[PDB]
Coordinates of C-alpha atoms and ligand atoms in Angstrom, one line a residue:
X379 CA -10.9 30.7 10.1
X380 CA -12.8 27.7 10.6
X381 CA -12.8 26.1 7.2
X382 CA -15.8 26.0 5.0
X383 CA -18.5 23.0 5.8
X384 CA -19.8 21.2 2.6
X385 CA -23.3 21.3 3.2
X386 CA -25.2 17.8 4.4
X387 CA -27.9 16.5 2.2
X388 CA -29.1 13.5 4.4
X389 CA -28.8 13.4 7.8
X390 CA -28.4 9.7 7.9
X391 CA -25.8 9.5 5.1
X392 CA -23.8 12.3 6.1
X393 CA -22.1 11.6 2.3
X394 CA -21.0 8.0 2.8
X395 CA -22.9 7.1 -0.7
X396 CA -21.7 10.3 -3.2
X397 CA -17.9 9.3 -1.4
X398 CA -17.3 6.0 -2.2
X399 CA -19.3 6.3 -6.1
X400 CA -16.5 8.7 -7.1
X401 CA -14.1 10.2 -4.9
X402 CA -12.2 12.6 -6.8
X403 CA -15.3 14.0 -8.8
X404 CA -16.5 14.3 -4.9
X405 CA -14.2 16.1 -3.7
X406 CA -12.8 18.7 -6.2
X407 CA -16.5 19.3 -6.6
X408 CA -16.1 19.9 -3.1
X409 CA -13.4 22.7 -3.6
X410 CA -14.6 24.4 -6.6
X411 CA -18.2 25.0 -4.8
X412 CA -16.4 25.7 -1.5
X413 CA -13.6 28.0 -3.4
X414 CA -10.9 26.5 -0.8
X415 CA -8.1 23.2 -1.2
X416 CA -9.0 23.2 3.0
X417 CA -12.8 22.0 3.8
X418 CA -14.9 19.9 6.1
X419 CA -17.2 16.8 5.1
X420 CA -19.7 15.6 7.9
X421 CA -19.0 12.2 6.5
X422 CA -22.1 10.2 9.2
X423 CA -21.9 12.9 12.3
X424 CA -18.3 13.3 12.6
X425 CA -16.6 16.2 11.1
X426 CA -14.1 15.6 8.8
X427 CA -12.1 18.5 7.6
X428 CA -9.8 17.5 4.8
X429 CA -6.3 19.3 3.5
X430 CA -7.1 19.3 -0.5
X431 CA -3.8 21.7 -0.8
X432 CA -0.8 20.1 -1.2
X433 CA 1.0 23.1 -0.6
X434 CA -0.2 22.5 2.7
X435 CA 0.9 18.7 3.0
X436 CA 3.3 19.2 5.4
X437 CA 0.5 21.2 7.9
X438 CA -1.2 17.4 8.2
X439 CA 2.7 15.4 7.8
X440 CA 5.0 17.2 10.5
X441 CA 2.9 17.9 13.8
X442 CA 3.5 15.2 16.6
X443 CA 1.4 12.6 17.6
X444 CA 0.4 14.8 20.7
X445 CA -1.2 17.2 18.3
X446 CA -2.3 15.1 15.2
X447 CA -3.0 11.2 16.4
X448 CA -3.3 8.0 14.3
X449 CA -4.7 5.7 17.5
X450 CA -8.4 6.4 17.5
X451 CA -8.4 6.2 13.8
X452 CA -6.6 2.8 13.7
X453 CA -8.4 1.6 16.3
X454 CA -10.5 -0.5 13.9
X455 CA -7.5 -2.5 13.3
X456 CA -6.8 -3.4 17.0
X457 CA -7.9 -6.9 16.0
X458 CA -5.7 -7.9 13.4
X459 CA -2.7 -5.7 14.7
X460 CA -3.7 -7.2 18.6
X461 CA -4.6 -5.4 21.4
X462 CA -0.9 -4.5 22.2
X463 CA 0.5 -3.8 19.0
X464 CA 1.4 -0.6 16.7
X465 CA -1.0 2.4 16.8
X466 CA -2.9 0.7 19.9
X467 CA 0.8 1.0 22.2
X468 CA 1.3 4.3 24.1
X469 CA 3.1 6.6 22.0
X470 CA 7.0 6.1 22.3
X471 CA 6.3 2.3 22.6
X472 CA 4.6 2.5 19.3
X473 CA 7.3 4.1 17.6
X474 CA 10.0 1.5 19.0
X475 CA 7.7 -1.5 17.5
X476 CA 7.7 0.5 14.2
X477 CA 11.6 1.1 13.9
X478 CA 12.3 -2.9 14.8
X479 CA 10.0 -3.7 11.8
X480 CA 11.3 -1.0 9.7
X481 CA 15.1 -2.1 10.8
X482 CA 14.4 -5.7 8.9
X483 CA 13.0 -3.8 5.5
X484 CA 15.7 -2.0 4.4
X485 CA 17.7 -2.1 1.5
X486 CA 20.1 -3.6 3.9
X487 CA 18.0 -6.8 3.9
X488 CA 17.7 -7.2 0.1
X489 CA 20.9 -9.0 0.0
X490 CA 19.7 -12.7 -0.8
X491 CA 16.1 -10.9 -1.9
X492 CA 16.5 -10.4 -5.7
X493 CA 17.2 -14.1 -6.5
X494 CA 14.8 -14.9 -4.1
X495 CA 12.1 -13.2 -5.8
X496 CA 12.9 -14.0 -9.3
X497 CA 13.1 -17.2 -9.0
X498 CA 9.2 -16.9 -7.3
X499 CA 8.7 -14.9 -10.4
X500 CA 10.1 -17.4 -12.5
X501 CA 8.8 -20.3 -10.9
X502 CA 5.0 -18.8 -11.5
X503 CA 5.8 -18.3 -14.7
X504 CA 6.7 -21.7 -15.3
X505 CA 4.0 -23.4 -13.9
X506 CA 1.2 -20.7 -15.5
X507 CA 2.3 -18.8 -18.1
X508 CA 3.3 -22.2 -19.8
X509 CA 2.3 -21.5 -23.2
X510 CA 2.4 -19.6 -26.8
X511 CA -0.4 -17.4 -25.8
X512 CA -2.8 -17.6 -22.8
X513 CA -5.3 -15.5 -21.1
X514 CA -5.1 -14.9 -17.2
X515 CA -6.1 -12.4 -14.4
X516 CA -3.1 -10.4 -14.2
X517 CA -4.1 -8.7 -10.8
X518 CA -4.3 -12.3 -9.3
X519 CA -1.4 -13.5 -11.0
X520 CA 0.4 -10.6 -9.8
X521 CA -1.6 -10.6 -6.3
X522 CA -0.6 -13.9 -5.7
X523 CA 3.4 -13.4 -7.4
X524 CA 3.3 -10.7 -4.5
X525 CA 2.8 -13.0 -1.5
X526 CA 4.8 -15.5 -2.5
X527 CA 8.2 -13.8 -3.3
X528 CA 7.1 -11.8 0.1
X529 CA 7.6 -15.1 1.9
X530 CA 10.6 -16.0 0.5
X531 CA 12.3 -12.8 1.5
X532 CA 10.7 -12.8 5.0
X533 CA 10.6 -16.2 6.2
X534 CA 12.3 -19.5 6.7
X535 CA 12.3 -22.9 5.2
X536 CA 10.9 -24.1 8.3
X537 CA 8.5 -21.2 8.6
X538 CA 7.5 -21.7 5.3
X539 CA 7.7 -25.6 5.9
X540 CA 4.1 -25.5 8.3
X541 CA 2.8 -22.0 7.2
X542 CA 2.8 -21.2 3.3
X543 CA 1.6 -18.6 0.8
X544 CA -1.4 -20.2 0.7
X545 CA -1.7 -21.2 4.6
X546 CA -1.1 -17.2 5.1
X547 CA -3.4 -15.8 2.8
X548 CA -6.5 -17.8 4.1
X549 CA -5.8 -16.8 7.8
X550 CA -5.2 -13.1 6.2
X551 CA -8.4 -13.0 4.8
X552 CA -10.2 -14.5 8.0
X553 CA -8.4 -11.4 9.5
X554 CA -9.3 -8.2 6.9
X555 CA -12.8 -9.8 7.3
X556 CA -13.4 -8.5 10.5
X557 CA -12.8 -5.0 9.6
X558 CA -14.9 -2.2 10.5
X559 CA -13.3 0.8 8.3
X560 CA -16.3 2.9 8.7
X561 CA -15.6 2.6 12.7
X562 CA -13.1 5.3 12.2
X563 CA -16.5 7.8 11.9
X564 CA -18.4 5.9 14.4
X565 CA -15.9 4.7 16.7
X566 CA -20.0 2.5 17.9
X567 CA -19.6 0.1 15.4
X568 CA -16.3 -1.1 16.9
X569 CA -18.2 -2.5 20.1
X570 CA -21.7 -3.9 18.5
X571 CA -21.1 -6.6 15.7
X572 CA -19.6 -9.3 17.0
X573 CA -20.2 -12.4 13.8
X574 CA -16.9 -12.5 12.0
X575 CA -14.9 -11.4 15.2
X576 CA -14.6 -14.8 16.6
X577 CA -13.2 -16.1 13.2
X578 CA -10.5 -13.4 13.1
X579 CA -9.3 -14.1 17.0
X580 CA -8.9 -17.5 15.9
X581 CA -6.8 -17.5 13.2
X582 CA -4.7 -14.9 15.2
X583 CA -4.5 -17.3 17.5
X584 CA -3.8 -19.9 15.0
X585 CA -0.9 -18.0 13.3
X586 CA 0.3 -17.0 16.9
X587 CA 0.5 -20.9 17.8
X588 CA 2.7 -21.5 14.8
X589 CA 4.9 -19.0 15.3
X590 CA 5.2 -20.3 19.3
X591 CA 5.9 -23.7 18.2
X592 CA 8.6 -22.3 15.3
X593 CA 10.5 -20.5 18.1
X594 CA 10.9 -23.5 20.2
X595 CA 12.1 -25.7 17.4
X596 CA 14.6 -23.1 16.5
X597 CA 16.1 -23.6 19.5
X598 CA 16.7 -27.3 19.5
X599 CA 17.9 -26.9 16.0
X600 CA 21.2 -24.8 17.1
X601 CA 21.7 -26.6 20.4
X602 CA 20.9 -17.6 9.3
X603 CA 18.1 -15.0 9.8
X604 CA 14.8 -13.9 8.6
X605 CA 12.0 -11.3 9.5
X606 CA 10.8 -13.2 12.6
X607 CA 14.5 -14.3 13.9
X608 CA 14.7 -10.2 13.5
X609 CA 12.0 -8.7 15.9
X610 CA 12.8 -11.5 18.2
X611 CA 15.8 -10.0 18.7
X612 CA 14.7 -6.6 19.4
X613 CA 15.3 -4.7 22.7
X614 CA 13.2 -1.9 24.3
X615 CA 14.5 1.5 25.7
X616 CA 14.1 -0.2 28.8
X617 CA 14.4 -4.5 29.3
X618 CA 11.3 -5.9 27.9
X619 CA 12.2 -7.9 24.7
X620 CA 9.4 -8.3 21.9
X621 CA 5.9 -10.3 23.5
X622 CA 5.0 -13.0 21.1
X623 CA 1.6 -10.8 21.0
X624 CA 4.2 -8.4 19.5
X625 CA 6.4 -10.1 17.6
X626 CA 2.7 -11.5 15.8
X627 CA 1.8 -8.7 15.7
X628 CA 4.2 -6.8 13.6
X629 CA 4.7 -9.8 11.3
X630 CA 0.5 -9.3 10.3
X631 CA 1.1 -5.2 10.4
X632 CA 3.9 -6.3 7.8
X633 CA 2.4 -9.0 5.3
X634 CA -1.5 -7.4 5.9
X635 CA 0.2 -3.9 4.9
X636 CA 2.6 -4.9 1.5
X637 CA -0.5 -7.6 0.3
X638 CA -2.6 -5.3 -2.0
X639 CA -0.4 -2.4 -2.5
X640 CA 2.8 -3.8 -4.2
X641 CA 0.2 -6.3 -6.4
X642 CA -1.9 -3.3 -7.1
X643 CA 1.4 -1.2 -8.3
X644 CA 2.7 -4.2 -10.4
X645 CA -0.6 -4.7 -11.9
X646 CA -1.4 -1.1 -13.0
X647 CA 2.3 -0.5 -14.0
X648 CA 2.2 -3.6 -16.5
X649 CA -1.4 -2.2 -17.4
X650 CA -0.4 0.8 -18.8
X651 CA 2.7 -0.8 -20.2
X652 CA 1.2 -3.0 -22.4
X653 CA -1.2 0.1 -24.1
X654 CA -0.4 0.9 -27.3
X655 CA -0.9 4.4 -26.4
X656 CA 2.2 3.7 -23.9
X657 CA 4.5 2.7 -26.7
X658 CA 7.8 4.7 -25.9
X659 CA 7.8 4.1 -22.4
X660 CA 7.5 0.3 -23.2
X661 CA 10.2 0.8 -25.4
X662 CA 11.6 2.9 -22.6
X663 CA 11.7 0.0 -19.8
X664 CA 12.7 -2.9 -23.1
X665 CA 16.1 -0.9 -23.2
X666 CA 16.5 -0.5 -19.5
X667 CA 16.5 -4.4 -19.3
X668 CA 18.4 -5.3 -22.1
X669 CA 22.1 -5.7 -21.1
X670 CA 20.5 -7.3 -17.8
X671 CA 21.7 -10.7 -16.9
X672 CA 19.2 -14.0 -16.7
X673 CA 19.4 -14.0 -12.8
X674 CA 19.5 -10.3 -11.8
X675 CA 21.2 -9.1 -8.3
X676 CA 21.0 -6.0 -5.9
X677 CA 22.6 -4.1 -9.0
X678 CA 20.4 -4.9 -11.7
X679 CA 17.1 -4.3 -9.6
X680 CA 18.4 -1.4 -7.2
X681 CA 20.8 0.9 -9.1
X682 CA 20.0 0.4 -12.8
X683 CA 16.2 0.7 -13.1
X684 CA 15.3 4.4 -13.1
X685 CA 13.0 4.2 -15.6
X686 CA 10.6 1.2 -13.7
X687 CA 10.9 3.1 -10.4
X688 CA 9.2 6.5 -12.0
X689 CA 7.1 3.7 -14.0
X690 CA 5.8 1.9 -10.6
X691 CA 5.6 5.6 -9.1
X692 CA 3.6 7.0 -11.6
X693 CA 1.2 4.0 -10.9
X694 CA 0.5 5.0 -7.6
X695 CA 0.3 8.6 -8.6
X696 CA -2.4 8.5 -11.0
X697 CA -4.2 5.7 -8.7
X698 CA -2.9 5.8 -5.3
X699 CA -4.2 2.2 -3.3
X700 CA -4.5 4.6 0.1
X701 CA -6.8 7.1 -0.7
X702 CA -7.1 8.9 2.3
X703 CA -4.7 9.8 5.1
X704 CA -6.4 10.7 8.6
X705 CA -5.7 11.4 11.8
X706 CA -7.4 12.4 15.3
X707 CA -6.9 16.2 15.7
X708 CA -6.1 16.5 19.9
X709 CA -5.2 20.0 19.9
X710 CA -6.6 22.9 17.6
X711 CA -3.6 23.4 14.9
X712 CA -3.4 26.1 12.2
X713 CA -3.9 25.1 8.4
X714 CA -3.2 28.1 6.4
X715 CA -6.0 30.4 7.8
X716 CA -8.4 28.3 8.5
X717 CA -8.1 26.9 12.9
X718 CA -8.9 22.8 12.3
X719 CA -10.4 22.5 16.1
X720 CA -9.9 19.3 18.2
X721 CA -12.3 16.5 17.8
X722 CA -12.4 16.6 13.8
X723 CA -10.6 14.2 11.8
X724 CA -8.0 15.7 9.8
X725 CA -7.7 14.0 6.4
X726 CA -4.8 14.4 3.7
X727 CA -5.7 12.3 0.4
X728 CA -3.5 11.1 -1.8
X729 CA -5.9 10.7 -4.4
X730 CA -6.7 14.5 -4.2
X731 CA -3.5 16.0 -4.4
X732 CA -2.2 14.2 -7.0
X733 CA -4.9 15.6 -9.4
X734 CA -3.9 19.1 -8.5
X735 CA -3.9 20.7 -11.9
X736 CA -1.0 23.1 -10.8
X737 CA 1.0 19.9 -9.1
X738 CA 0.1 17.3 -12.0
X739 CA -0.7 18.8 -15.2
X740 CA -2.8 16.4 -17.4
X741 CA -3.7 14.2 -14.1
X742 CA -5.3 11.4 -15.7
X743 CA -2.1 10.7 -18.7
X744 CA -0.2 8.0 -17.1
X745 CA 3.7 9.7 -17.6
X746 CA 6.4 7.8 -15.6
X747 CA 8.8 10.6 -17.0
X748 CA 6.5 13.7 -15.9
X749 CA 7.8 15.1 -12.3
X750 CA 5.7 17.1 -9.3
X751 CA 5.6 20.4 -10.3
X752 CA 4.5 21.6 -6.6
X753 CA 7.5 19.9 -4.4
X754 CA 6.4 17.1 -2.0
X755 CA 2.9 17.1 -3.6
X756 CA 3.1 13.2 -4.5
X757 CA 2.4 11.7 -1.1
X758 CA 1.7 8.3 -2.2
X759 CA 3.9 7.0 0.2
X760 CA 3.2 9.7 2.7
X761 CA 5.1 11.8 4.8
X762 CA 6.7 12.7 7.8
X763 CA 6.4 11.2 11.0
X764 CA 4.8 8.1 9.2
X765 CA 6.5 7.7 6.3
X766 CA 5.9 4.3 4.9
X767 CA 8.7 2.1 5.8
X768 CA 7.8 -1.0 3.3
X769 CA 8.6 1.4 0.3
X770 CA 11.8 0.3 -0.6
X771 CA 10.7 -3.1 -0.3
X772 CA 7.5 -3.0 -2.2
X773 CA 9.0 -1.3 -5.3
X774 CA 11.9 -3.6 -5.3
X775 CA 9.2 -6.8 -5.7
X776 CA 7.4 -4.4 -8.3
X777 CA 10.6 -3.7 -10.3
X778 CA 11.8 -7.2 -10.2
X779 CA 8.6 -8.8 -11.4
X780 CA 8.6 -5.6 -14.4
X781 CA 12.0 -6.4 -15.3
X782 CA 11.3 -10.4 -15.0
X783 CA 8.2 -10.0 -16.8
X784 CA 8.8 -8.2 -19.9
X785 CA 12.2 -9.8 -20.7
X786 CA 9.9 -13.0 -21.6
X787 CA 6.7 -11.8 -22.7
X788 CA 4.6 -9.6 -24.4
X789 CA 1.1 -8.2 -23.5
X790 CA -2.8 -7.6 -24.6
X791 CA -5.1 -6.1 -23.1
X792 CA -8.0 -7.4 -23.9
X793 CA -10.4 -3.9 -23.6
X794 CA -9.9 -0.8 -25.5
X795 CA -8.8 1.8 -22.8
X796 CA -7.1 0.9 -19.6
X797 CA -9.4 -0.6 -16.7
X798 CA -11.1 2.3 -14.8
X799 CA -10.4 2.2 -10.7
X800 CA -12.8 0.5 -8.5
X801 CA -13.0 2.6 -5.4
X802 CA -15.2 0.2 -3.7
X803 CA -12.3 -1.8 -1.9
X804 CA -9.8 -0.6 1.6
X805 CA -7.2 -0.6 -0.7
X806 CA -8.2 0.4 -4.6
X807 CA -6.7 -1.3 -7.6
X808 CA -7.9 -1.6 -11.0
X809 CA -11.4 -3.7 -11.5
X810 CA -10.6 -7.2 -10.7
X811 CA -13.2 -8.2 -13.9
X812 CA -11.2 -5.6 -16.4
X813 CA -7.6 -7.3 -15.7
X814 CA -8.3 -10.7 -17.8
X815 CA -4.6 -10.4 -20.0
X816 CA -3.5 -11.5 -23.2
X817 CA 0.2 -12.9 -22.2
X818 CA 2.6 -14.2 -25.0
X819 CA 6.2 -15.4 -24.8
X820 CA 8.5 -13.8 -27.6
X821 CA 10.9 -15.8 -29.3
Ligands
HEM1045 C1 3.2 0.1 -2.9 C2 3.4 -0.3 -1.6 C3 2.9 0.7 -0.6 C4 2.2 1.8 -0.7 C5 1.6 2.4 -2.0 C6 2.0 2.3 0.6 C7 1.3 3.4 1.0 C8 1.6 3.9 2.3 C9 1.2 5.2 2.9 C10 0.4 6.2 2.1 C11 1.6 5.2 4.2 C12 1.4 6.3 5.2 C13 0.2 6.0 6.0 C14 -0.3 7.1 6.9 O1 0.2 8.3 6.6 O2 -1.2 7.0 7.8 C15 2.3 3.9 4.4 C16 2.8 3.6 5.6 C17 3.3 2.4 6.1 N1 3.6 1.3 5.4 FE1 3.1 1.3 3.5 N2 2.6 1.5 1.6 C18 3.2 0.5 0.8 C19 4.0 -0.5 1.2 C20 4.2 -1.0 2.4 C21 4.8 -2.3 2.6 C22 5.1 -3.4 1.5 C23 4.9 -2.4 3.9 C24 5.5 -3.7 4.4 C25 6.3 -3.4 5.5 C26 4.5 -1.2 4.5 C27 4.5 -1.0 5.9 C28 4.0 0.3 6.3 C29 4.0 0.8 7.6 C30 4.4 0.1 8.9 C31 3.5 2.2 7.5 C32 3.3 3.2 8.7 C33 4.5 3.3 9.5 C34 4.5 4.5 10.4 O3 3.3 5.0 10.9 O4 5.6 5.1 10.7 N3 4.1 -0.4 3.6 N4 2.3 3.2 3.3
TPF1046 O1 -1.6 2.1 6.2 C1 -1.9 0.7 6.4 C2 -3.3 0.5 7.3 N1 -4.4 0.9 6.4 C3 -4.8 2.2 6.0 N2 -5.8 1.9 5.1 C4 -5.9 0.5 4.9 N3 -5.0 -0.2 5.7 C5 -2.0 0.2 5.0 N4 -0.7 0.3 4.4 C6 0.3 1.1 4.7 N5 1.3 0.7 3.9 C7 0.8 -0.3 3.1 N6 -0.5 -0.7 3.4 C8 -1.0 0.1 7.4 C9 -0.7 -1.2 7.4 C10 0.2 -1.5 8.5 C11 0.7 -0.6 9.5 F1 1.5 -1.0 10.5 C12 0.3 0.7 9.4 C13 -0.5 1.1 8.4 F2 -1.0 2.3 8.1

């Protein structure tokens, strides 16, 4: 009943290196020798016992946080999140934080969102995809689509009148350039290395400062909402409002988590599309669109686009951007037979499960019409008790930019076969240096 323990090659190592080269080759390797979906890694000293059955999801989705815990393993992010914020807050505290932001990213909210987007959509198209025929980096192009219809939605004129896409980005990236990830194994590195930590708490600072200043000038100005108006607004089960530590805080936890997952999904979604192998389902999404009007509406984007939703799903099914799920274990819990004892991480990943033979058939054949054949075994969104709350959100930026896109354009690749993953990022996409396009306008 304690799982099998995949045996460790390199003390130093642990398996860090065979890991991140290939993943998936790593770990059903990992099963087949081990002859069990449930198995432990000693990924750098630290047991790592992961749940490669998705019949078992729900054994790693449904316990409470007293029992399976996200804070030491989010930890590393305590910096860009802040000291207060999210997974770092004591545990009913956290979850209150989480509902505010969640309450301003429903499909509630996307009432002015769809024109608000397309016209982003449009208005990159306009200025870059001017001509005949053009080559481009489609996962920047959609990358930086991404941020700015995020913006649009999220933000006001006068948020977006001293803090813009581009302001945001760069203090991002002086942000996600602090991170430790492997600190979740070696929770050491997190005290240590100290050289690009002063250039993250500075442009926390500096998007803090904005944000103060904002406030205060929205309250001369009254003497209609947005995200920040939002959380701002927000009460605690006791008095406490929202901190503007907090308030910060979530905004980052919000743009930091929807930046390279809803580009990634747009990017691999039009990928596939515009293969000739993928001929019917491009044909598929052209008649979805066709009766659509110029400037789409809740409607158009929400109700009518079945087909791009189990497109922009089976995206993240074949290559899921968050590979891994994990979380501290606090208090031995059962996982099938098999006792996964307090101390190891427990892992669920997405990229595992969903190239469960019996759960995906033919794993690697991108099919937006194919279905789980093992119920809840797609967990590219994950499950239970943190469910991703930006889903609705993301997909409805990923549909609208599908839909806007291939009304007015065609695609080439310019490669033979689809671009392979690149599992050396946080958050995988296609290879950056395989995504050059061929665009064209119709007619
Ligand atoms: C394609 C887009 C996205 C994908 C593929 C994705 C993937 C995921 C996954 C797998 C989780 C569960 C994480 C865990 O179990 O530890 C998650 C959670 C979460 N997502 Fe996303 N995510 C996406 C979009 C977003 C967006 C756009 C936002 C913007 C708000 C967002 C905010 C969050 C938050 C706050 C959580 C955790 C909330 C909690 O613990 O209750 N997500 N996402
Ligand atoms: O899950 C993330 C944090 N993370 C895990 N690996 C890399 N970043 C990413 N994420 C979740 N949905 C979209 N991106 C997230 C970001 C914010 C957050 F509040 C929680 C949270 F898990």
């Amino acid at each position: 009943t304690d799982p099998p323990v995949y045996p460790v090659t390199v003390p130093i190592l642990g398996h860090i290196i065979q890991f991140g080269k290939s993943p998936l080759g790593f770990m059903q390797e990992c099963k087949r020798q081990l002859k069990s979906g449930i198995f432990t890694i000693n990924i750098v000293g630290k047991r790592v016992t992961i749940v490669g059955d998705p019949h078992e999801h729900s054994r790693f989705f449904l316990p409470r946080n007293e029992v399976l815990s996200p804070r030491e393993v989010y930890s590393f992010m305590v910096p860009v999140f802040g000291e207060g914020v999210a997974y770092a807050a004591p545990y009913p505290r956290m979850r209150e934080q989480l509902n505010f932001l969640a309450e301003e990213l429903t499909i509630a909210k996307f009432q002015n969102f769809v024109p608000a987007i397309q016209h982003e959509v449009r208005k990159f198209m306009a200025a870059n995809w001017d001509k005949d025929e053009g080559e481009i980096n489609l996962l920047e192009d959609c990358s930086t689509m991404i941020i700015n219809t995020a913006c649009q939605c999220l933000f006001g004129e006068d948020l977006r009148k001293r803090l813009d896409a581009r302001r945001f980005a760069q203090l991002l990236a002086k942000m996600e350039s602090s991170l430790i990830p492997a600190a979740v194994f070696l929770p050491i590195l997190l005290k240590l290395p100290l050289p690009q930590s002063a250039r993250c708490h500075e442009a926390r600072t500096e998007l803090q400062k904005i944000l103060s200043e904002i406030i205060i000038a929205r309250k001369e100005e009254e003497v209609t909402s947005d995200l920040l108006s939002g959380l701002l607004s927000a009460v605690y089960r006791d008095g406490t409002p929202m901190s503007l530590h907090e308030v910060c805080g979530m905004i980052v936890a919000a743009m930091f988590a929807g930046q390279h997952t809803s580009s990634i999904t747009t990017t691999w979604s039009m990928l596939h599309l515009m293969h000739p192998a993928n001929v019917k389902h491009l044909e598929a999404l052209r008649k979805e669109i066709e009766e659509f009007p110029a400037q789409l509406n809740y409607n158009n984007v929400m109700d009518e686009m079945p087909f791009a939703e189990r497109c922009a799903r089976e995206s993240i099914r074949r290559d899921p951007p968050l590979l891994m799920l994990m979380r501290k274990v606090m208090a031995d819990v059962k996982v099938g037979s098999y006792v996964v004892p307090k101390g190891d991480i427990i892992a669920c990943s997405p990229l595992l499960s969903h190239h469960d033979e019996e759960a995906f058939p033919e794993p690697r054949r991108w099919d937006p019409e194919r279905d789980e054949k093992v119920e809840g075994a797609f967990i590219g969104f994950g499950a239970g008790v943190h469910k991703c709350i930006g889903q609705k959100f993301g997909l409805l930026q990923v549909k609208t930019i599908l839909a806007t896109a291939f009304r007015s354009y065609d695609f080439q690749l310019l490669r033979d076969e689809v671009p392979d993953p690149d599992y050396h990022t946080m958050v995988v996409g296609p290879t950056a240096s395989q995504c050059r396009v061929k665009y064209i306008r119709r007619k």
